[PDB]
């Protein structure tokens, strides 16, 4: 009963100091876990989404929604704790060019979820509006056997909801290019839409 | 009087407040009913126009007095997801946000910390208002102590 | 006095040039009258009107507020209308600011950026003329204010100003500057005749639409709605209101 959408509550300033009900904290406090306890919950994502899905494509694009609802949380956290609350800072750049947020995702999102920075970030040289991001080892899909890459898409929805809430409407698609002795190399191609494309030209 | 609002992605509001001095207790006399949301929704657009400008009309988070209309200035803050913290200031004479410009930058950062703290609840979707009794005390103690 | 004869010439000159400025119609094509203040020139009605307005504005700037600002606006309108005809009045029209740059300050030679500077100085001269009695004529001696006739100058200033912004990637005038230079009139707007107040909000909606500001449009149509509701007289149905309610 604070913001109803029926009205704007009109309340006078400089009232009393009220009681304190719930107080949280926001710094990182780098607390670890075991990769088995992650991979068990990832296979319990997939062991229900195999059950309540009829074809492949809607399984793809509702495994992606779980990653969407981690990406739109994580975008507001990572810049805000990288620019550093009551230890008052000077805030971050709020990046607004497509190869200034790709450097941020490439060097900080993958260094946040995973221990290492992702290795390469490859422009599609022979055309425009495709932007590859690769690694050498997807450490969440690494217990899936076979070759079909539907089980990839929980990480790629983390990418897509990172950009869709950043003002950059895109669409990701993952593929597998087994280059060299890295048999699981697993490119994602970020593929921005047409209606964004004029705006960074002007 | 002061009007403060958090405007969402589709321009749908998620927090909506006014707070004002006790000299004029019924604040914003015949503007709060009929101009005060219109000037907010009308002057979202220059804040939206300023989100893709590198230099204004090397921080790009705080924005100054972006509009001045009948002697009411508004101030803005474009967060990382794009929720914009626009706030209308009203007075008797020509109000100055320049006396609080060093101050209330740490009012926008200290409400953006509260928005990040209420984003992390996984039950909280986007495009629904903040029905939080904790949020009101957490914003009005900040409004009382730091104006 | 010398100021009395200068006031007589200041009353004479601008009106003596204004009807010859108003003696142009479809660039004066085959209208040979009795040749008493109707020359019917081929392509020099703008040139003769510009020479008349140049002499009149020179005499009024030598007699230097309200009629001075109207004289400077008349010289600006004569230069703009002479440039609007594709003619040879370019160097003569640019050098025709001999008293306009003495009382005003044009100091340019571009496509109406000189007229932008002259229009800003004309609004500054009308703002200096606001520091006077509210109405200086005979029938305008107990009128509203100078606030009902400054507004007709700056709304046609905006109407002439925003057309320089054609949408493309060259912008002749940055997009924010006429958005700034239309918000200067927060005059009270409380009382005047209503059919000025429909027209100012309608063209302020149209300048916001051509700039591409799709919520300031909703603001000025809401002001149009509030001004239409509270009028004390009675109005009738017209199909303009149909499409007005449809676009809002």
């Amino acid at each position: 009963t604070v913001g109803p959408k029926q009205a704007i509550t009109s309340e006078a300033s400089t009232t009393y100091i009220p009681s304190r009900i719930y107080s949280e904290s926001l710094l990182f406090k780098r607390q670890e876990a075991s990769l088995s306890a992650m991979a068990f919950l990832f296979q319990e994502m997939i062991s229900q989404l195999h059950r309540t899905c009829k074809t492949a494509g809607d399984f793809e694009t509702k495994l992606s929604d779980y990653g969407h609802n981690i990406g739109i949380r994580l975008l507001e956290l990572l810049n805000f704790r990288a620019s550093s609350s009551n230890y008052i800072t000077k805030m971050r750049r709020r990046d607004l060019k497509i190869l200034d947020i790709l450097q941020f995702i490439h060097g900080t999102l993958w260094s946040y979820l995973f221990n290492h920075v992702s290795d390469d970030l490859v422009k599609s040289s022979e055309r425009d509006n495709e932007y590859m991001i690769v690694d050498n080892f997807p450490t969440l899909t690494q217990f899936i056997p076979g070759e079909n890459v539907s089980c990839e898409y929980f990480v790629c929805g983390i990418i897509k909801g990172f950009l869709f809430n950043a003002g950059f409407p895109c669409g990701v698609t993952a593929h597998r290019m087994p280059q060299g002795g890295h048999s699981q190399r697993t490119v994602y191609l970020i593929q921005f839409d047409r209606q964004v494309l004029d705006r960074e030209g002007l | 009087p002061q009007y403060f609002a958090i405007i969402g992605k589709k321009d749908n509001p998620v927090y909506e407040i006014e707070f004002t001095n006790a000299e004029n207790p019924q604040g914003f006399p015949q503007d709060l009913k009929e101009l005060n949301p219109f000037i907010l929704h009308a002057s979202l657009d220059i804040v939206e126009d300023l989100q893709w400008q590198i230099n204004p009309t090397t921080d790009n988070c705080y924005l100054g007095k972006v509009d001045h209309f009948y002697g009411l200035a508004i101030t803005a803050y474009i967060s990382y997801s794009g929720m914009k913290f626009v706030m209308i200031h009203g007075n008797s004479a020509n109000s100055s946000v320049v006396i609080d410009d060093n101050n209330m930058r740490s009012f926008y950062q200290e409400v953006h910390e509260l928005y990040v703290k209420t984003l992390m609840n996984p039950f909280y979707k986007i495009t629904d208002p903040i029905r939080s009794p904790a949020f009101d005390s957490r914003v009005r103690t900040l409004a009382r102590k730091h104006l | 006095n010398r100021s009395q004869q200068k006031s007589l010439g200041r009353q004479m000159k601008i009106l003596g040039n204004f009807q010859l400025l108003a003696g142009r119609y479809v660039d004066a094509l085959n209208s040979f009258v009795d040749a008493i203040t109707t020359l019917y020139k081929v392509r020099d009605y703008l040139w003769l009107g510009s020479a008349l307005d140049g002499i009149s504005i020179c005499f009024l700037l030598l007699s230097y507020n309200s009629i001075s600002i109207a004289a400077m606006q008349s010289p600006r309108n004569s230069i703009m209308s002479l440039s609007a005809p594709a003619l040879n009045i370019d160097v003569e029209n640019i050098n025709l600011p001999l008293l306009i740059k003495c009382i005003s300050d044009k100091v340019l030679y571009y496509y109406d950026l000189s007229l932008m500077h002259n229009s800003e100085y004309a609004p500054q001269v009308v703002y200096c003329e606001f520091l006077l009695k509210t109405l200086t004529f005979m029938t305008s001696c107990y009128k509203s204010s100078e606030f009902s006739k400054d507004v007709l100058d700056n709304i046609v200033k905006n109407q002439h100003r925003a057309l320089s912004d054609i949408p493309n990637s060259p912008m002749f005038p940055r997009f924010e500057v006429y958005f700034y230079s239309n918000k200067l009139f927060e005059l009270q707007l409380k009382e005047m005749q209503v059919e000025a107040q429909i027209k100012i909000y309608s063209t302020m909606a149209e300048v916001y639409r051509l700039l591409g500001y799709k919520r300031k449009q909703l603001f000025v149509l809401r002001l149009l709605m509030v001004a239409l509701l509270a009028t004390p007289n009675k109005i009738a149905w017209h199909p303009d209101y149909r499409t007005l309610i449809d676009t809002i």
Side-chain angles (χ1 to χ4, degrees), chain A residues 1-82 84-202, chain B residues 1-19 22 25 27-147, chain C residues 9 16 22-23 28 35 49 51 54 70-71 75 84-86 97 122-123 137 139 146-174 176-248:
Chain A
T1 78
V2 163
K5 66 179 72 173
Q6 287 70 241
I8 46 166
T9 61
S10 164
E11 211 57 10
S13 61
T14 70
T15 61
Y16 62 99
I17 297 89
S19 186
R20 304 306 292 257
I21 308 106
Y22 192 34
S23 167
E24 302 98 305
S25 179
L26 205 58
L27 61 84
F28 64 96
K29 65 154 299 291
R30 193 141 310 290
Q31 172 180 17
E32 294 293 328
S34 70
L35 198 69
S36 68
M38 185 63 72
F40 276 142
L41 201 73
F42 188 118
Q43 63 84 30
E44 272 305 349
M45 211 156 278
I46 296 192
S47 77
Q48 304 315 293
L49 276 296
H50 266 310
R51 190 178 278 145
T52 81
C53 275
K54 300 289 94 176
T55 181
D58 77 313
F59 163 72
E60 296 294 329
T61 80
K62 81 168 162 309
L63 191 43
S64 170
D65 187 277
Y66 289 160
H68 203 295
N69 287 20
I70 305 187
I72 77 183
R73 283 85 170 94
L74 211 58
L75 158 75
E76 291 266 290
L77 187 153
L78 276 196
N79 303 118
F80 182 76
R81 187 180 68 189
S84 74
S85 79
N86 43 7
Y87 182 76
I88 297 90
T89 68
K90 291 179 179 179
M91 273 305 327
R92 210 187 168 270
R93 178 60 172 161
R94 195 197 44 91
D95 47 352
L96 72 164
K97 164 44 42 183
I98 63 162
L99 282 72
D100 293 323
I101 208 177
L102 278 190
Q103 313 269 298
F104 177 69
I105 190 166
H106 181 74
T108 316
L109 196 75
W110 274 59
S111 81
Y112 180 61
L113 316 181
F114 297 102
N115 61 353
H116 63 290
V117 176
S118 159
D119 62 357
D120 291 331
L121 170 49
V122 172
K123 262 65 64 178
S124 288
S125 70
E126 284 153 22
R127 38 217 178 274
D128 213 26
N129 221 28
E130 293 83 4
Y131 288 84
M132 293 187 213
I133 190 167
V134 306
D135 61 357
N136 290 318
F137 206 62
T139 62
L140 308 180
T141 301
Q142 66 156 344
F143 297 151
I144 302 299
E147 170 53 12
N148 212 349
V149 75
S150 72
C151 51
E152 201 56 274
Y153 273 10
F154 170 68
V155 74
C156 84
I158 290 172
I159 307 299
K160 184 178 184 293
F162 197 86
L163 308 177
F164 207 98
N165 218 28
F168 294 81
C170 84
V172 287
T173 308
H175 307 269
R176 283 195 57 169
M177 322 285 198
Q179 177 262 1
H182 306 265
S183 159
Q184 43 273 50
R185 190 159 143 271
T186 74
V187 55
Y188 320 99
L189 61 94
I190 314 170
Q191 191 159 36
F192 298 95
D193 213 315
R194 312 305 311 233
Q195 73 182 329
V196 65
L197 274 172
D198 45 356
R199 185 204 78 216
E200 70 275 16
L202 190 143
Chain B
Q2 270 74 26
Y3 186 80
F4 172 69
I6 302 180
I7 301 299
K9 284 274 273 152
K10 212 272 190 184
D11 115 318
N12 52 356
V14 287
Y15 193 57
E16 60 285 49
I17 210 74
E18 73 77 21
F19 42 87
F28 265 120
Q30 287 69 240
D31 274 340
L32 192 82
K33 278 74 69 177
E34 73 268 53
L35 276 296
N36 190 359
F38 292 99
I39 192 66
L40 196 72
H41 163 75
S43 57
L44 293 187
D45 165 19
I46 56 176
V47 177
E48 182 36 79
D49 190 359
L50 258 59
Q51 89 172 350
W52 304 122
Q53 283 333 299
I54 297 90
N55 283 351
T57 186
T58 301
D59 190 359
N60 290 318
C61 282
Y62 199 84
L63 282 72
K65 74 93 171 183
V66 65
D67 198 357
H68 175 274
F69 185 90
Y70 323 111
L72 310 187
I74 62 170
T75 60
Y77 181 91
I78 289 170
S79 57
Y80 291 151
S81 47
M83 321 276 268
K84 39 187 65 53
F85 281 80
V86 297
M87 151 175 188
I88 314 177
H89 319 262
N91 224 334
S92 307
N94 278 103
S95 52
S96 179
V97 307
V98 193
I99 191 167
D100 266 324
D101 62 358
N102 55 311
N103 264 345
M104 61 80 71
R105 184 191 300 72
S106 77
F107 165 72
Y108 289 165
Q109 292 147 345
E110 281 294 359
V111 298
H112 183 222
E113 201 284 340
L114 276 296
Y115 175 63
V116 161
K117 266 178 55 162
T118 180
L119 197 43
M120 302 296 79
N121 181 23
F123 289 93
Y124 168 71
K125 310 173 53 53
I126 309 298
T127 52
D128 53 357
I130 309 185
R131 294 179 67 188
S132 178
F135 212 70
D136 208 2
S137 72
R138 287 317 170 110
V139 66
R140 68 183 68 188
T141 52
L142 182 51
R144 151 163 72 255
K145 292 310 181 275
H146 183 74
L147 193 59
Chain C
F137 311 102
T139 187
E146 294 293 328
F147 277 8
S148 168
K149 65 179 72 66
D150 178 38
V151 65
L152 61 83
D153 184 348
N154 44 46
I155 180 64
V156 76
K157 181 266 290 181
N158 219 27
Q159 208 164 12
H160 295 179
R161 172 82 181 122
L163 296 174
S164 52
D165 188 19
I166 303 109
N168 166 298
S169 46
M171 295 355 231
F172 271 14
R174 64 151 311 141
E176 203 272 335
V177 66
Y178 38 85
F179 165 70
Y180 182 75
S181 86
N182 69 24
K183 293 202 293 312
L184 74 165
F185 62 100
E186 309 321 302
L187 32 96
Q188 289 20 73
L189 278 170
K190 307 166 186 173
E191 69 275 16
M192 61 215 97
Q193 197 263 359
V194 285
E195 310 281 289
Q197 325 177 32
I198 296 90
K199 189 40 79 174
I200 190 167
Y201 290 155
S202 74
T203 192
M204 193 158 139
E206 275 152 316
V207 68
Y208 281 152
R209 186 273 304 278
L210 276 296
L211 157 63
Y213 274 21
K214 302 278 294 293
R215 282 83 59 85
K216 304 299 297 317
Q217 193 138 30
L218 196 70
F219 194 39
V220 290
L221 281 71
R222 198 250 173 198
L223 289 201
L224 186 67
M225 281 315 148
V226 170
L228 263 189
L229 273 180
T231 187
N233 56 346
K234 54 181 76 65
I235 63 182
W237 181 65
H238 187 292
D240 189 359
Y241 303 112
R242 183 92 60 200
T243 191
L244 180 63
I245 298 161
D246 291 331
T247 178
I248 194 167

